[PDB]
Amino acid sequence: PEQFRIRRDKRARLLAEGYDPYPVAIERTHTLAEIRATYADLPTDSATEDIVGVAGRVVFARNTGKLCFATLQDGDGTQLQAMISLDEVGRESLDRWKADVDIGDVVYVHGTVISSRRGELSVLADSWRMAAKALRPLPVAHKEMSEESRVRQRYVDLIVRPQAREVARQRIAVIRAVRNALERRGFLEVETPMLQTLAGGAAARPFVTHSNALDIDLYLRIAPELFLKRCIVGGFDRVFELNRVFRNEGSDSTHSPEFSMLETYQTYGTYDDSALITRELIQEVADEAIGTRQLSMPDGSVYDIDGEWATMEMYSSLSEALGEQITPETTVARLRDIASGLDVEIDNSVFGHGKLVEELWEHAVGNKLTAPTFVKDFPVETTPLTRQHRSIPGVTEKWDLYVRGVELATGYSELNDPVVQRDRFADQARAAAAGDDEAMQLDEDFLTALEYGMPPCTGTGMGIDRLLMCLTGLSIRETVLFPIVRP
Ligand SMILES: C[C@H]1CCC[C@H](C[C@H]2Cc3cc(O)cc(O)c3C(=O)O2)O1
Numbered sequence: 254p255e256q257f258r259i260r261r262d263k264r265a266r267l268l269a270e271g272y273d274p275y276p277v278a279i280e281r282t283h284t285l286a287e288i289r290a291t292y293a294d295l296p297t298d299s300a301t302e303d304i305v306g307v308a309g310r311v312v313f314a315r316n317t318g319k320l321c322f323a324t325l326q327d328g329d330g331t332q333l334q335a336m337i338s339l340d341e342v343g344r345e346s347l348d349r350w351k352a353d354v355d356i357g358d359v360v361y362v363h364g365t366v367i368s369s370r371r372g373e374l375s376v377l378a379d380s381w382r383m384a385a386k387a388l389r390p391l392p393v394a395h396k397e398m399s400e401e402s403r404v405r406q407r408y409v410d411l412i413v414r415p416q417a418r419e420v421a422r423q424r425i426a427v428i429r430a431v432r433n434a435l436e437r438r439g440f441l442e443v444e445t446p447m448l449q450t451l452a453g454g455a456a457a458r459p460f461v462t463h464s465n466a467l468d469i470d471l472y473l474r475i476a477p478e479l480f481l482k483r484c485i486v487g488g489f490d491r492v493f494e495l496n497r498v499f500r501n502e503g504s505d506s507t508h509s510p511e512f513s514m515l516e517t518y519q520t521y522g523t524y525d526d527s528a529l530i531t532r533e534l535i536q537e538v539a540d541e542a543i544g545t546r547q548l549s550m551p552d553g554s555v556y557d558i559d560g561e562w563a564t565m566e567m568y569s570s571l572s573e574a575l576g577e578q579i580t581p582e583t584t585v586a587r588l589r590d591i592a593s594g595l596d597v598e599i600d601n602s603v604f605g606h607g608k609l610v611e612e613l614w615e616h617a618v619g620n621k622l623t624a625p626t627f628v629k630d631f632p633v634e635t636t637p638l639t640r641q642h643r644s645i646p647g648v649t650e651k652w653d654l655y656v657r658g659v660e661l662a663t664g665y666s667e668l669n670d671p672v673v674q675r676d677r678f679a680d681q682a683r684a685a686a687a688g689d690d691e692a693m694q695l696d697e698d699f700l701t702a703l704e705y706g707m708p709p710c711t712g713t714g715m716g717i718d719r720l721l722m723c724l725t726g727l728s729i730r731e732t733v734l735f736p737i738v739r740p
């Protein structure tokens with residue numbers, strides 16, 4: 254702040270002396286990574302006759318009599334030494350280096366490539382220019398930034414913390430690997446709308462906004478599911494969308510109101526076929542983007558995601574954990590007595606057979622899972638868009654995938670019968686009459702699309718930020734460049 258005034262004074266002084274502190278048209282001949290790669294076998298204390306013009310952020314500096322040193326860091330983190338010698342740039346230019354250049358400044362250095370006496374790959378400057386005067390100093394070390402500071406100023410965090418650049422790179426690589434795995438399998442990527450006149454496809458409160466052009470309220474999508482199914486009616490055979498959804502709910506280490514998700518749809522497959530593809534995709538993504546299926550976690554542990562994953566049924570695994578047979582016919586009263594006997598808090602929101610079964614399963618089974626696990630065959634009350642089971646009464650052909658304790662993905666045999674789907678919406682209407690404001694509202698145009706005939710298909714959904722959390726052990730806020738902060 255005292256430091257801010259000083260740097261601002263320098264900026265103005267340069268502009269008034271004719272030395273442009275934010276010049277345009279600087280040509281950079283090599284990145285620093287290019288210099289380090291080309292000259293990796295340069296002998297110590299030797300010089301070349303190759304002239305280069307590099308640019309980079311000054312992150313370290315040393316001053317002596319006729320010779321100043323500075324460590325430049327390119328945007329990717331690669332570092333190279335710049336040497337400002339009296340006998341090379343001249344009295345007038347060297348003095349300007351000492352008085353004008355500060356830590357954090359972006360500078361351009363033109364000179365010849367050498368290796369210093371200490372074996373440091375360097376550019377021996379014959380000239381230099383300010384490229385971008387910095388008015389604020391960098392933190393002395395990334396340890397000095399709180400976690401909230403990293404989120405509020407990711408642009409500083411990327412400069413000073415190598416792990417921040419590495420997570421950003423992993424995110425980009427994971428998403429590219431996801432698309433590669435789906436392209437190998439013949440899936441096509443489409444765009445469906447983000448502003449919707451009715452937001453369905455999941456159970457969540459929407460963000461609401463007023464349209465000036467249409468003169469009505471619109472909703473940000475909570476899922477692309479109902480529009481991807483219209484694509485299936487229209488003839489897309491294998492289709493996906495990897496992009497943002499928006500849910501107007503709470504924030505914690507596994508939930509962000511704005512997040513990235515993948516949804517896939519495949520005709521003439523069931524939830525058994527999408528469980529197989531989802532496992533292989535995750536494992537291929539690990540290979541391509543992380544380099545291993547034995548995942549290093551931040552606490553030093555190794556998490557094995559290789560091989561085939563366990564599968565279990567919700568009702569039967571719950572029954573085993575409790576020592577009592579739970580079925581679709583178990584009463585709401587019985588389920589509440591079981592919960593209270595296990596000291597399970599049941600929010601005044603959670604009611605109905607289906608929600609009570611899921612709650613008990615999460616407490617007695619789900620929270621105790623370590624290895625990657627599919628749980629399948631869900632209560633029909635909580636799965637309005639899922640086809641009923643081909644042979645077992647009262648359940649639907651859905652699975653959830655848990656990896657490292659995180660709910661990562663889900664897959665359905667899709668409900669394509671338009672009459673039954675209309676019945677499912679009526680059951681949601683009764684739930685919403687009982688006070689559930691997450692219940693789905695009936696979408697008449699979606700039903701109209703089903704009434705033209707949707708081929709049988711299987712769909713999946715996967716949280717992309719959650720995928721990265723599972724691969725790295727990070728929380729959802731560490732995997733996004735710019736998570737939302739209250740101003
Ligand atoms: C697209 C779906 C399919 C099932 C797994 C996963 C659940 C999903 C829930 C969810 C809800 C929410 O309000 C905020 C969030 O960040 C997430 C999330 O990351 O993941 O993503």
Ligand SMILES: N[C@@H](CCCC[NH3+])C(=O)O
Nearest residue numbers: 454455476478712713714
């Ligand atoms: N729409 C689902 C993901 C796809 C479900 C399978 N059709 C969700 O948001 O949870």
